[PDB]
Design a protein around this ligand. Structure first.
Ligand SMILES: *C(=O)CCCCCCCCCCC
Ligand SMILES: *C(=O)CCCCCCCCCCC
Lengths: 406, 406
């Protein structure tokens, strides 16, 4: 029954360590992809990634960071930013039963799980493993490592759904507020970047391997010669809040979440059916009586995936399709963190009135003909935006956000 | 607004491969803990575990099982049982937008995450890794691997929260129905059992190590000489359904879910605060006009944990406490699968009118004095039952289930 808005955001990504840096990159169509000596040394074929350009050493208290893996660290930093951006003080959100946290990652921590196994097999056994691997490697690490130090008393758990992970976290947060159980819920996620995890993707042939010499051109959603996505890492968090509660404290409102769709393909384990995406987008548009001005597609730069989504978009919008752009062309695929980060990019476009470009399209794919895929930064007042997130196992999520009247 | 009931269940645990075996074990007070050569050979101090005594070979189609890890296998078999028990046919739950699945695991698959890293570092590299490690190792493996083959079209994702994982999955399923978004939601989870995961717990001193010579006595919740929990694996699944929809199809109803609590401690990373549990139980009891007849405790058999929960119980019920028993004394701690399996044990006690015994208590802990702890199988007509699930990161979940009027 309650209305839900976003009143704060935080982000650590391949194209910026805060929203100011991210805004700059989006407007310039700047790539965050670099060559990775780590991936190459591991024996992989894909040697490019969207890495976080930031030394996190000493940014978090020793007694707090000892339980964390990179996914949790990225999410933590993003939350600190979100709290400051939202203008919330400790006395308001801490030890408050009406304030919760829903954040997750797609793979937990392959790095620390492998570390533990490797240590256990050495001559020092248990002594070499140490007592902190469980909180670093458990699937709920991102929520557990944040809810505790931030003194959260409300809901506390992680939602995981591969590449749709953080989108579902935001959606579930919305639901908690609509149910009247929470007034504020920090929602987002994080994902570490390491060969331990990346090699499994390369092994299934999902990663780009043809552009290692020109890193910034590897991620090329919609380009006729795309050859897989570029793995990335990072984190993001947004403050989901009940409308009256936000207005009562004089919060800055970025937008209202007016639609949330969550569906399942029930078809293929790794490829989207398209049919599920159609139902997801429609579900998210139910009751939304303003046109979608911009759509931030899932578009990972894969042969099948890119066009399956475009086909879904055509069926949903008919001859009234919105401006479209795939920011992954610039940032790479941050997996579990993709949902929240892309929701954030969309919010920035909505807040500053511009559409970020879909870069690296040298030869548009035949199946993309006729659609308005923006390839250059465009100034334009936007009112309603949509963001898609699809994951392995046929899990779909769509979020629709709209400016609040006045 | 909608009322929610459980119309089917499935389970694969250390004390039974279906509800018939589980029921017999609960009544007899039979342990499912055995000696593990695998754990001993790995270099661990804890050599006992609650293993699934079932050969799963050929129980799942080749093309489907190739994408799964053990957690998914256990959950899959549990879902098959639940579907048959619920009396649902393919046309009833398949390709139906109103039917979903919410199931998870606490750690995904440490075994396959390590396999991938090991294979990659060998002479075959990517070829040895293979194309199936991602779906086996990703945190959402359990939901992805079930939703796809069972043709699920509704919600599809995993909730993870350490030892409260599958309890939150059931609670979220309840919310989806209350929101009127789904008519049926399969909820539960699974967890693999392997040294790759167990050694990290031993490394932090969380597992029992003093009773390897007498495996069946290692797990002893509330006993003065307990020394940590006994790790276990397995799966569970329940059919969460809207009341009218269930009645309309002549379904057998085990009970109605009349309360669901989800809170956070915001205190310690590994130990429960007690305060969070109090708030969680009170939240789940709100509006419930009948007394709690039986409480299936979290009780993992750890020095600190066991008494913190007892203190919370005492705070909530005072001198009028319900009958209490920790089934983990029999089954071991199945981590991510604990929530749903224990909900199932509780439903069986409600359905068959008996209280399972809290075994292995040779010297009751002094802090348990004055509480109604049951140590002998006791026939008694139950009407309302409660089950607690707490996890690392201070995450709490409580479910309250009650019989439906006549
Ligand atoms: C998006 O759907 C692509 C798949 C993301 C899965 C989450 C990350 C899993 C890492 C597992 C490492 C072996
Ligand atoms: C319950 O809270 C006890 C902790 C369970 C955490 C989930 C299982 C994580 C295993 C993988 C990391 C070692």
């Amino acid at each position: 029954m309650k209305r839900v808005v976003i009143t704060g955001l935080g982000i650590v990504s391949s194209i910026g360590n805060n929203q100011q840096e991210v805004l700059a990159s989006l407007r310039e169509g700047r790539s965050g992809i670099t060559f990775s000596q780590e991936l190459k040394d591991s024996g992989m074929r894909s040697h490019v990634w969207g890495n976080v350009k930031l030394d996190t050493t000493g940014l978090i208290d020793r007694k707090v960071v000892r339980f964390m893996s990179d996914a949790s660290i990225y999410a933590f930093l993003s939350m600190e930013q979100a709290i400051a951006d939202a203008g919330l003080s400790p006395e308001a959100y801490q030890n408050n039963p009406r304030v919760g946290l829903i954040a997750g990652s797609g793979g937990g921590s392959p790095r620390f799980q492998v570390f533990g196994a490797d240590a256990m097999r050495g001559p020092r056994g248990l002594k070499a493993v140490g007592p902190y691997v469980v909180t670093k490697a458990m699937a709920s690490g991102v929520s557990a490592c944040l809810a505790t130090p931030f003194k959260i008393h409300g809901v506390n758990y992680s939602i995981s759904s591969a590449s749709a992970t953080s989108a579902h976290c935001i959606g579930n947060a919305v639901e908690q507020i609509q149910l009247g159980k929470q007034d504020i819920v920090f929602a987002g996620g994080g994902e570490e970047l390491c060969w331990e995890m990346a090699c499994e993707f390369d092994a299934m042939g999902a990663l780009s391997t043809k552009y290692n010499d020109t890193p910034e051109k590897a991620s090329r959603t919609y380009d006729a010669h795309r050859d897989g996505f570029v793995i990335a890492g990072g984190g993001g968090m947004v403050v989901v809040e009940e409308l009256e509660h936000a207005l009562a404290r004089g919060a800055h409102i970025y937008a209202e979440i007016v639609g949330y769709g969550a569906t399942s393909d029930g078809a293929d384990m790794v490829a989207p059916s398209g049919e599920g995406a159609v139902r997801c987008m429609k579900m998210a548009m139910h009751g939304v009586d303003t046109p979608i001005d911009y759509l931030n597609s899932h578009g990972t730069s894969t042969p099948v995936g890119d066009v399956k989504e475009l086909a879904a978009i055509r069926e949903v919008f008919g001859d009234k399709s919105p401006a479209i752009s795939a920011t992954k062309a610039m940032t790479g695929h941050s997996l579990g963190a993709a949902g929240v980060q892309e929701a954030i990019y969309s919010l920035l476009m909505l807040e500053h009135g511009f559409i970020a470009p879909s870069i690296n399209i040298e030869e548009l794919d035949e199946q993309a003909a006729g659609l308005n895929i923006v390839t250059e930064t465009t100034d334009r007042e936007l009112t309603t935006v949509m963001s898609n997130s699809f994951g392995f196992g046929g899990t779909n999520a769509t979020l629709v956000m709209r400016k609040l009247k006045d």
